Design a binder for this molecule. Structure first.
Ligand SMILES: [Mg+2]
Ligand SMILES: [Mg+2]
Ligand SMILES: [Mg+2]
Ligand SMILES: [Mg+2]
Lengths: 140, 233
């Protein structure tokens, strides 16, 4: 057979999911973004390309905050990134509503994890077109 | 909630030349048991709004949590959360009044009466009331519970009309409010000596004062009250 790369939940015969792999290309193709852990915090940074002089400087903000204590930044398909944060924000609100304490960063990572992994399970959705760098300060 | 359990009494408030003042005792009662003494019913929201709450405390605590989360959400994708697009009083109020009317309309009310006090980014005083039925109104003075009956009368002696608000200083307004708390202490069986008071001034900003006590009480005369009619000793 061929065309193992046309449908999203499908394993090729080498064990791979080509649509996820192709999503990585959309990411490799995006602008640069990074994270640096310092020894009581973290720092996020990102290159915003200037298409035109007509852009308003300062004003097309690409780093997004979650809850009060978490920063996310992402490279790739920007709308997919935003969608993912909107999810992350519901996920943090639900966690905090029930458990009171603002969501611990590892806990929050696995929330995004599971949701993203979830879009590689079915052929009726498309995998996320972003790599996301995020983090913050929890009680550990 | 279909019947309130732990309850807070009167919130009182008035507006003066540059801001507003609002106050409330630190008690949660359980019927006639004065159960919880360390209860803050003033809820500041940003640095330009204080929301004061009476009625059911479990519902108050729910409303607190909604307010925290409104602040959190307004910050999202909002470079001007700390500036031109922070929350105004008028917004927090509309939101609460919406929620109240909605909960009433599903026969499942939040068993509260709330007063939102603040100063609007354009300098203006804000003071509005909403309660469990979704009913709203504004006045130079506002109070819930007993306060409507005893505090308003006194605070209206200071600001009887709109035109008096410019004339009323923050020293005068504050002394008026403190006196009202003393009156309610004397006469509301569901009230406490300890209270909190907050000022929102368009120049000094938000001053929040915890742990006040009613002082300068008169009781001495009580020593000459003997019997209920004809007993002399
Ligand atoms: Mg009530
Ligand atoms: Mg909002
Ligand atoms: Mg609503
Ligand atoms: Mg005396």
């Amino acid at each position: 057979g061929t065309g193992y790369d046309l449908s999203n939940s499908v394993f090729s015969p080498d064990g791979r999911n080509f649509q996820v792999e192709y999503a990585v290309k959309a990411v490799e193709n995006g602008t640069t973004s990074i994270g640096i852990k310092c020894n009581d915090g973290v720092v996020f940074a990102v290159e915003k390309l200037i298409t035109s002089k007509l852009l308003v400087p300062q004003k097309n903000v690409k780093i997004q905050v979650v809850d009060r204590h978490i920063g996310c930044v992402y490279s790739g398909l920007i709308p997919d990134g935003r969608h993912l944060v909107n999810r992350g924000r519901e996920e943090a609100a639900s966690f905090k509503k029930l458990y009171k304490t603002p969501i611990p960063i590892p806990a929050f990572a696995d929330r995004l994890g599971q949701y993203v992994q979830a879009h590689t399970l079915y052929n009726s959705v498309r995998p996320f077109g972003v790599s996301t760098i995020f983090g913050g300060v929890d009680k550990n | 909630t279909q019947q309130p359990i732990v309850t807070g009494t009167s919130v009182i408030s008035m507006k003066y030349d540059n801001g507003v003042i609002i106050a409330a005792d630190n008690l949660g009662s359980y019927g006639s048991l004065l159960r919880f003494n360390g209860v803050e019913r003033l809820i500041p929201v940003g640095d330009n709004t204080v929301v004061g709450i009476s009625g059911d405390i479990s519902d108050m605590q729910h409303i607190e949590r909604l307010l925290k989360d409104l602040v959190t959400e307004n910050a999202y994708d909002n470079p001007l959360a700390d500036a031109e697009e922070a929350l105004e009083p008028s917004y927090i109020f509309e939101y609460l009044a919406t929620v109240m009317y909605q909960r009433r309309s599903k026969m499942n009310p939040l068993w509260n009466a709330i007063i939102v006090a603040g100063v609007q980014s354009n300098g203006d005083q804000f003071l509005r009331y909403v309660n469990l039925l979704g009913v709203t109104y504004s006045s130079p003075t506002l109070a819930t519970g007993f306060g409507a009956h005893m505090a308003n009368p006194l605070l209206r002696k200071v600001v009887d009309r709109e035109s008096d608000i410019p004339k009323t200083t923050v020293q005068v307004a504050e002394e008026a409010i403190v006196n009202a708390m003393r009156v309610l202490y004397y006469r509301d069986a569901r009230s406490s000596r300890n209270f909190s008071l907050a000022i929102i001034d368009k120049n000094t900003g938000l001053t929040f004062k915890k742990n006040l006590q009613v002082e300068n009480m008169k009781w001495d005369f009580a020593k000459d009250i003997k019997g209920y009619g004809t007993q002399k000793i």
